[PDB]
Amino acid sequence: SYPIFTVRWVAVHTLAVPTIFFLGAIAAMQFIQR
Amino acid sequence: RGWFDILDDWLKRDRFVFVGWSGILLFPCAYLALGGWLTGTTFVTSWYTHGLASSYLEGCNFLTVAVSTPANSMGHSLLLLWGPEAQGDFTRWCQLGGLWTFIALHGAFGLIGFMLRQFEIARLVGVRPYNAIAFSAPIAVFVSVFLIYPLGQSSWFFAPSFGVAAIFRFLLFFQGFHNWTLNPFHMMGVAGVLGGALLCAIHGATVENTLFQDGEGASTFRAFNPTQAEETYSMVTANRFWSQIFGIAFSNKRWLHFFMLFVPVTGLWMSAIGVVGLALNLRSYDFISQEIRAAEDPEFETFYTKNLLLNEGIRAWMAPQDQPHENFVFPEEVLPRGNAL
Amino acid sequence: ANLWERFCNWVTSTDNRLYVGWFGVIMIPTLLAATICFVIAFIAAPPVDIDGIREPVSGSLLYGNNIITGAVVPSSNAIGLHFYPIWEAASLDEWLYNGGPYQLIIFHFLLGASCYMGRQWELSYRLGMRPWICVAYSAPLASAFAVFLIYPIGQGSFSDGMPLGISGTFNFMIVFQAEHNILMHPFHQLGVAGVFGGALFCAMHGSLVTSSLIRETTETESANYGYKFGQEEETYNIVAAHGYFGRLIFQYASFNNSRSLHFFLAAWPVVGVWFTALGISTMAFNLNGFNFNHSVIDAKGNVINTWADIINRANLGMEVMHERNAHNFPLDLA
Amino acid sequence: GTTGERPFSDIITSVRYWVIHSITIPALFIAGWLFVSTGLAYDVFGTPRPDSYYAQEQRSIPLVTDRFEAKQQVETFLEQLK
Amino acid sequence: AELTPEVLTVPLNSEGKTITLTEKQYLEGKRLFQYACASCHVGGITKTNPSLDLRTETLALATPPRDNIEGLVDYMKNPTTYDGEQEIAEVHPSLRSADIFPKMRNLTEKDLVAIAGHILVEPKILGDKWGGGKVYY
Amino acid sequence: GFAWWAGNARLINLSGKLLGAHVAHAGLIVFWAGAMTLFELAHFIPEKPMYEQGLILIPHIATLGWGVGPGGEVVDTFPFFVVGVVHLISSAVLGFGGVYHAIRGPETLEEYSSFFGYDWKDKNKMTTILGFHLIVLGIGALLLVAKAMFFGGLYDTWAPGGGDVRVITNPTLDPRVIFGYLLKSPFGGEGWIVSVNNLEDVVGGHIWIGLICIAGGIWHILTTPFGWARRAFIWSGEAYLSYSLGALSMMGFIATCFVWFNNTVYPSEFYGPTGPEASQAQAMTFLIRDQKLGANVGSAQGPTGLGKYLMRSPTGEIIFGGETMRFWDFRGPWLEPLRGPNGLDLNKIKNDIQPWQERRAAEYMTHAPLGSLNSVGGVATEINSVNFVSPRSWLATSHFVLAFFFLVGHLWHAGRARAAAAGFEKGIDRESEPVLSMPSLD
Amino acid sequence: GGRIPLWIVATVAGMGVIVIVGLFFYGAYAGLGSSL
Ligand code: CLA
Ligand code: CLA
Ligand code: CLA
Ligand code: CLA
Ligand code: CLA
Ligand SMILES: CC1=C(/C=C/C(C)=C/C=C/C(C)=C/C=C/C=C(C)/C=C/C=C(C)/C=C/C2=C(C)CCCC2(C)C)C(C)(C)CCC1
Ligand SMILES: CC1=C(/C=C/C(C)=C/C=C/C(C)=C/C=C/C=C(C)/C=C/C=C(C)/C=C/C2=C(C)CCCC2(C)C)C(C)(C)CCC1
Ligand SMILES: CC1=C(/C=C/C(C)=C/C=C/C(C)=C/C=C/C=C(C)/C=C/C=C(C)/C=C/C2=C(C)CCCC2(C)C)C(C)(C)CCC1
Ligand SMILES: [Cl-]
Ligand SMILES: [Cl-]
Ligand SMILES: [Fe+2]
């Protein structure tokens, strides 16, 4: 009997969600030519 | 049992991450300072404030990305999103350096929130607040360097930019212009940081090498129980070793741990004081007696005079690119140079 | 009962106010030779031609220096890595002019400090202790080896070792940055993390223990009198400390095994300073900090400066000015 | 020892967790990528593209030199590239 | 700014004919310059003789003028001193001396045009940085 | 009772599994030697100097005389291929025995055979295993002598005509020369064994070492430790490990200086110029340049009063001026033709500098062993362009790092071995704390 | 609850990090920031 949505859930996703999005953006950057 | 006491109940519940009343200040501010740094180092230029590339999007690596100070022409403007300079335009705000004040101001308020947090948790758990007190030292350093120092100068532009290489340039600036290594307040800070590092290593090793044999395993970590009353290492044998090796040793376990608090905290406070003087160009740059002798006596040379020649080279060779708003044009023939080089 | 065994018993005795030991047998004479010569030179030595260009630098107090500018000056670049004891000079005057005192001090010092490490092992053995305190001391010792011996070996001359003085130290680190870009070298970056982190953890551990002292005194006394030397029970409550610090961050970010915590306290600054000693020692062989000069260019090919290029401007200013008279040819290759 | 949340190691080894996150994680990765590859990121933040740091013959930085005319100075710099 | 055909247009000979390299040739020449020449000529200077750089204004006053594709391709085959008075194949890399400078062995005639083209385009992009030395770094 | 992170300590008294650990690990060393060579060859371009190509294994093979001809030029790459291939193949055999003895073979050996089984405290058996390995090593040293004297020779950077592969017919046997080296000072101008500057002394040294190791191998098979050795050492597996760690660390520091200073067994044609060499080359380069312009390099007074191009060492020799005065102990084949009895000879400098010496000096000054961690060649202030870090810098730095840590591991394991042997490596017995039974210091 | 073995999750996550860090190090040699 555990909850899914806690304060802890929020903190974790507040960091993890933009972290992956940013990793995608930086990945795309390696294929940019001048 | 009104609404305040109900909220107080909820803020102070034992959970994986404790919140508290200070979480209302700390968590938004800490998250926005961090979020602003990552946003800016990933996407934002310094082309209009500095003439620099500073983001991953522009080709910079982790060492060279930065969130840079605003342009010198902004003075000490708060640079609010909605203020007279950016006038609500988010894009212009980024290009004018608004992320720097955003990060620096939210950061300041986050540090307040964190210290409040140390006070709050100490009160609930029932211990003395010396961890909060020790944290005063990073606060003094933050506000003296990121707030008091540029406020004494012409603009935010001369504060530190938030980045690895940009901080390195700040170190060299302070040498060439302030001769900051010569400052007794920095020397005291250096002694405090190196002294703390020393104390940290020597206390960890002494404990680890005066352990009592409290188990049979060759891994000695298992032979400790967090509820045991007995000391896990011999203070008596440690005192004897250091007394014979070094001449003196600790004998009081509380004095030792207070001394560990005292040494780096004090060093940081001292260095903070010296930066306050540098806010006003109140440097310890020169020794007058040296200069009078050297001016009159072209054979008198010391390591002191040698370093000022180095300082003069730093100023003359970095200033045009590092202070672009001044439009310094130094023709080749005026640049200070030794032979051949 | 034999005269030699009586001497051996005194040397290794655990009852001497200061332990001597077999390592002590080498350390005491060498540290006294280095100390006495350093004091005398710091106060009275005449100017020394450190760069072999017949341009003496004044290091001693009697020759117009104060505590901050004074130094025992490195030996002449004309000597390079050649051994220069007193008995190789035609006179003490010559030996002083050419920087003899510096070689004498650093060689005796390096020997004595190496034996100091040995003596830390040795007494630990006589006292029934675990052996590894000397392993912690090897990080500062390696750092002293790097700036006094290893770096002169890589660059060909003891004149590029670190001067024995406060201003001389700064000259050494300013010249090092131009020539090697040490700020951009990851082993110096880890050294900073070892030393910043060391001071941090020192403050944390001191403040957590102090925060959880068990009440044992009145408000009119130093809490320190709550601890009696050699008492058996702990003087603070680690459960309270852990309970505070776990809630400050989160639970598993905090130590509750005091042996793990203190091993962590030892490891972090020691490993960080190993790396920084290694950074100096490998920059001795000119494997330098990262170089990102002109690494960003636009579509046409204009250079787009970064903070690394600004660092380079500062480095350039150090390069062109240091030893302003000692270079006849366009490259400063050592 | 526990405050009532579900243990992390129990979650990340649960199949339901991986059913949800094998979608959410790459979707976010793809999302950020397109933010860059469509060029949106340049326009949101005002970051020069490789061809828009200088005018063709220009050798000078477009350095903001006024406080209250700053927003308009950048706009004047930008139109000198069109 | 970008690499426009006007940028990539350089003199072919002393009679004022021009040639327009392509982006390909420019990057080809830059690669080849770094492989065969940059150990002494990084940035358009000359480490082993700083008095003589690769600036277009210096090349134009060489005898044989060398501020054009022809003069440069000739130089890489049969280099001479600045006044044209003596040949220096034995101390300067060239095709005439590829036996003693082995990196010159595999350069074809089109490689020489790209290298030459690179040397003439570059001061048009970098201005004073090309051949200026550390003052402009 | 060791934790997982100290897991390999569990093998101390399991001689079967510890054998496979050693043999499989020896497969990793031979594997890397094989693969690195094939990688280096696959990337090798013969028109470029080796030191412009980040090669460190091909230069060791070329130095043995394979693949190269006059002047150091690569003439045939098949020897490189073979050495890489044979090493790689061999690593599978060793890996095979390694994992067999680690997983399936008898967990301990002393029940299966009294020959291969050993006890660390058995001073007789230990010295016998030492003796076998001393003989193997002695054969190893003689294999180099064979190659030098009977199988095509070795590359000789000093050979007249620019360097060449030369068969060594008269190795130096005079013990006054061989052991004379071992008694030279390590300080400048002397350089201890790093000063060896001719292959006759090199080959002669290996004849002596081969014989001494074989003689010592047989001595240690036939004897047991004398009583004075018995009371002076700790006799345990960890203690022996600690001794070898000290020895490897010493060896690593010596190798570091060898590759940094020595240009005989590390020829500069393959590894690039040494530090001192490149610095001397710059002085030579501008001497040549200025003298062609009409400069009288013998009489030119520089800004300090010292000669701009030429000055005296502290013992009087004519040497190059400028900062390279510190490097006047450098000796190299492109420079030595200019040396007379008093140092550099002004009449040779004015008349006998050959174009190949001008070429070589220009080449070496522009390849000085200076560069950045990301392989930008030159001083720290140089702009991107030249991709170069000298093999001498890569080899010297890596082996200093390794040497340093193995000295730490010596301290770690020697201290522990002493404490383990005396019974207090796990901590102090509360009931019998030595200090508590000692009188107080005051 | 404990379906996917934790050591398998640790290996794939670890390989995934290596992939991305390797991509960033390849990019220091190509495109923007390469010096070419
Ligand atoms: C407690 C959390 C917290 C704190 C302390 C701050 C603090 C700050 N923020 Mg941050 N911010 C936060 C949360 C927080 N923010 C959150 C959650 C977000 C996400 C939306 C942001 C987004 C954000 C941006 C985008 C910016 C800031 C900025 C600022 C700075 C200027 C603030 C200011 O002038 O306020 C002024 C407003 C107040 C002080 C409100 C006080 C309310 C009073 C007490 C009541 C007034 C009554 C009412 C108005 C009357 C109505 C009239 C009626 C007739 C209709 C300051 C450092 C600016 C900055 O950093 O620029 C450099 C900026 O541009 N913040
Ligand atoms: C011939 C060399 C040699 C040998 C055979 C041993 C053997 C042993 N050592 Mg000693 N040691 C050595 C060298 C050696 N050591 C050196 C050079 C040092 C100095 C650093 C030490 C320091 C040392 C300590 C401090 C301890 C030992 C211990 C041990 C025992 C357990 C080791 C174990 O299970 O590790 C398991 C292996 C690991 C945990 C892996 C270590 C990970 C390393 C540090 C990272 C290396 C990666 C490298 C830097 C490149 C990075 C690439 C990246 C992809 C990872 C075992 C008897 C333990 C002991 O006393 O037992 C009696 C112990 O506590 N060793
Ligand atoms: C040079 C590296 C090296 C080597 C050769 C060994 C070897 C060994 N270790 Mg040590 N170890 C190492 C590094 C190494 N270790 C490091 C870095 C750590 C830290 C994580 C440890 C931690 C550790 C612990 C904690 C323990 C050991 C133990 C052992 C022994 C038994 C292991 C076993 O049965 O596993 C069983 C494993 C398997 C069956 C999995 C398959 C492994 C195979 C051999 C891989 C072969 C791959 C390759 C493709 C083979 C091709 C074959 C072909 C050539 C024919 C064995 C001799 C154990 C021991 O001492 O027991 C008494 C033990 O408890 N080790
Ligand atoms: C130093 C390493 C070493 C040591 C000490 C041992 C020791 C032992 N092994 Mg192991 N083994 C090794 C390496 C080693 N082996 C390697 C490399 C392999 C893979 C080929 C094996 C594969 C292996 C198997 C499959 C078995 C053993 C077995 C045994 C035991 C009996 C062997 C016997 O009677 O041979 C007596 C002597 C000989 C047969 C003569 C060998 C002469 C060799 C082949 C020539 C010398 C090689 C040369 C010097 C170096 C190579 C040259 C090259 C560079 C070109 C013994 C404990 C057996 C065992 O214990 O079973 C329970 C067993 O079944 N071993
Ligand atoms: C891997 C090599 C190796 C190893 C580990 C050993 C190990 C051992 N040998 Mg053997 N030995 C070897 C090779 C080796 N030997 C060879 C090749 C020979 C033939 C010459 C011998 C001849 C030999 C004899 C004749 C004897 C031993 C003995 C011993 C034992 C005592 C060693 C001792 O006291 O050293 C400690 C060293 C000393 C007390 C003196 C050191 C003197 C050196 C020269 C000082 C200089 C060091 C300096 C810092 C570096 C510069 C070099 C210098 C020369 C300039 C020990 C078991 C003894 C024993 O018990 O025999 C059964 C013994 O009497 N060995
Ligand atoms: C500003 C702003 C804002 C905010 C924002 C934010 C909030 C953001 C966030 C963001 C984020 C939050 C981000 C993140 C990202 C991250 C990243 C980018 C990461 C990376 C990392 C990595 C890369 C790592 C790696 C590693 C290493 C190195 C080692 C170990 C392993 C690992 C893997 C860990 C708002 C809107 C309010 C409005 C105003 C403006
Ligand atoms: C014990 C142990 C361990 C270890 C292991 C080891 C270390 C092993 C080794 C192994 C090895 C060491 C292996 C090797 C192998 C090899 C091989 C397998 C080979 C092959 C080869 C080939 C096949 C080749 C081919 C070719 C040719 C012939 C020619 C050219 C081309 C080529 C190259 C392709 C561990 C820690 C993990 C775990 C625990 C236990
Ligand atoms: C090959 C060669 C050569 C030769 C070499 C040789 C001949 C070598 C030898 C070497 C040797 C012949 C070595 C020796 C060694 C020694 C040592 C290294 C020692 C050790 C010792 C110790 C470590 C001890 C310790 C101790 C003490 C002191 C006291 C008591 C305790 C004990 C015992 C622990 C030459 C150069 C010509 C050239 C090139 C090649
Ligand atoms: Cl200087
Ligand atoms: Cl020079
Ligand atoms: Fe403690």
Numbering used by the authors:
A (entry chain F): 12 to 45
B (entry chain D): 12 to 352
C (entry chain A): 11 to 344
D (entry chain E): 3 to 84
E (entry chain V): 1 to 137
F (entry chain C): 32 to 473
G (entry chain J): 5 to 40
Please give sentences taken from the publication describing this entry.
In natural photosynthesis, the light-driven splitting of water into electrons, protons and molecular oxygen forms the first step of the solar-to-chemical energy conversion process. The reaction takes place in photosystem II, where the Mn4CaO5 cluster first stores four oxidizing equivalents, the S0 to S4 intermediate states in the Kok cycle, sequentially generated by photochemical charge separations in the reaction center and then catalyzes the O–O bond formation chemistry. Here, we report room temperature snapshots by serial femtosecond X-ray crystallography to provide structural insights into the final reaction step of Kok’s photosynthetic water oxidation cycle, the S3→[S4]→S0 transition where O2 is formed and Kok’s water oxidation clock is reset. Our data reveal a complex sequence of events, which occur over micro- to milliseconds, comprising changes at the Mn4CaO5 cluster, its ligands and water pathways as well as controlled proton release through the hydrogen-bonding network of the Cl1 channel.
At 1,200 μs, the Ox omit map density is below the 2.5σ threshold, indicating that a predominant fraction of Ox has shifted from its original position in the cluster. The contraction of the Mn1–Mn4 and Mn1–Mn3 distances starting at this time point suggests that the onset of O2 release happens around this time. At 1,200 μs, the densities for all the terminal water ligands (W1–W4) and the bridging O5 become weakest. A comparison of these omit map densities within the OEC with that of the O2 atom, which is believed to not play a prominent role in the S3→S0 step, shows that the reduction of the density is specific to these five atoms (W1–W4 and O5) and Ox. The overlap of the O5, W2 and W3 densities is no longer observed at 1,200 μs. Once O2 is released, refilling of the cluster with a new substrate water seems to occur immediately. This is based on the observation that there is no missing oxygen density besides Ox, although the omit map densities of all the terminal waters (W1–W4) and bridging O5 are weakened at 1,200 μs. At 1,200 μs, the D1-E65 residue rotates toward W40 for the second time during this transition, accompanied by a shortening of the W42–D1-E65 distance by 0.4 Å. Thus, a hydrogen bond network from the OEC to the D1-E65/D2-E312 region, similar to what we observed at 500 μs, is reformed at this time point. The D1-E65/D2-E312 distance elongates from roughly 2.6 to roughly 3.2 Å, which points to a substantial weakening of the interaction, likely forming a configuration that can accept the next proton.
